[PDB]
Amino acid sequence: NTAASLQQWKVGDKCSAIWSEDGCIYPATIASIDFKRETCVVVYTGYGNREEQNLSDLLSPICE
Ligand SMILES: N=c1c2c(n(Cc3ccc(F)cc3)c3c1CCC3)CCC2
Ligand SMILES: [Mg+2]
Ligand SMILES: [Mg+2]
Q1: Burial class (CB in 10 A: 0-12, 13-18, 19+), 40
Q2: Whose CA is nearest to atom 3 of ligand 1?
Q3: Do residues 42 and 50 touch, judged by C-beta distance below 8 A?
Q4: Among 11, 14, 19, 55, which is least packed by CB within 10 angstroms?
Q5: 9 Cβ below 6 A of ligand 1
Q6: Could you tell me the residue range of the domain that residue 61 belongs to?
C-alpha cells in the first residue's frame, strides 16, 4: 504494498538530490527504495557514487 501504491517515486526514476557537502543539487537515478522507511539510494550521474536520501528530500529532475 500500500505504501508503494501511494508513492510517486520508483526504482530507475531520474530525480535530483542535494549533495549536502557542497550545498548544491545534482542529477541522480533511484537505485533502491525502502517504501516502509521512505528512503532510497540514489546514484549520481557521471560520478556514479551512491548515497542514501529520504524520499521526502528528492527533487524534480534537473532539466535535460
Ligand atoms: N561525487 C560528487 C562529487 C562532487 N559533487 C558536487 C559537485 C560540485 C560541482 C559540480 F560541478 C558538480 C558536482 C557531487 C558528487 C555527486 C553529486 C554532486 C564534488 C566532488 C565529488
Ligand atoms: Mg508507511
Ligand atoms: Mg523493512
Answers
A1: buried
A2: 47
A3: yes
A4: 11
A5: no
A6: 1-64
Q: Which resolution, in Å, applies to this structure?
A: 1.1
Query: What is the residue whose three cell numbers read 546514484?
Result: 43
| DSSP character string of 16-52 | EEEEGGGTEEEEEEEEEEETTTTEEEEEETTT--EEE
- Kindly state if the Cβ of 47 falls inside 6 Å of ligand 1: yes
Beta carbon of 49 within 6 Å of any ligand 1 atom: yes
Method: X-ray
Total domains in the fold of the chain: 1
Q: How many CB atoms lie within 10 A of CB 50?
A: 12
Are the C-beta atoms of residues 44 and 51 closer than 8 Å to each other?
yes
